[PDB]
Amino acid sequence: PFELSGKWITSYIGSSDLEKIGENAPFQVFMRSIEFDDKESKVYLNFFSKENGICEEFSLIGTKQEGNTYDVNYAGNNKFVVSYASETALIISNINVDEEGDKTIMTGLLGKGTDIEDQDLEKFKEVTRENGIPEENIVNIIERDDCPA
Ligand SMILES: O=C(c1ccccc1)c1ccccc1
């Protein structure tokens, strides 16, 4: 039986729009935890991001929607789904529509710390590829996460 709630740290992110994931972009997200509250149909997300190269922390609350998808407001509107779950990782697929109306598809591989299991990494590359995102649009987040624990 799986527990999806708990500490989750980003290892890699892929994006159909590179403007959304480099240095200080809104979706270069360093996850810290995700709590799924199925009783209240909500999800709680805590993570760091950088603006001005300095770490900033966010705690968001999303709403459970149809088909195990969640809606959450952050740099526009987001609809995401936990596409894959193992005992060591989560792969999340997110569609963002920003304030300008531009749509971006992104994937993220999450784990319990810094030591990546290749089996989880191969699944992340396949989900990324399936979403039309090229290999070169993958950023290594563990290498860039120097925000507090
Ligand atoms: O792109 C997101 C994401 C980034 C890394 C892992 C999981 C999800 C995201 C989705 C919804 C809200 C905030 C951030």
Which strands sit side by side in the sheet containing 54-65, from one edge to the other?
6-7, 30-37, 42-51, 54-65, 69-73, 77-85, 89-97, 103-111, 9-15, 138-140
Q: How far is the CA of 1 from the centre of ligand 1 (A)?
A: 24
What resolution does the deposited structure have, in angstroms?
1.8
Name all residues whose Cβ lies below 6 A of ligand 1: 10, 13, 27, 29, 31, 45, 72, 74, 78, 80, 92, 94, 106, 108, 110
The encoded tokens of residue 45 equal 């997300």
- What single letter denotes the amino acid at residue 45? L
Report the candidate in 143, 135, 122, 123 with the shortest Cα–Cα distance to residue 16: 135
The whole-angstrom separation of Cα 115 and Cα 11 is 9
The whole-angstrom separation of Cα 101 and Cα 74 is 14
Give how far the C-alpha of residue 85 lies from the chain's centroid of Cα atoms, to the nearest Å: 13
Fold assignment, 1-149: Lipocalin (2.40.128)
- Residue 123: helix, strand or coil by DSSP? helix
User: Cβ contacts of residue 105 below 8 Å, gap of 6+?
Assistant: 15, 16, 93, 94, 95, 131, 132, 133
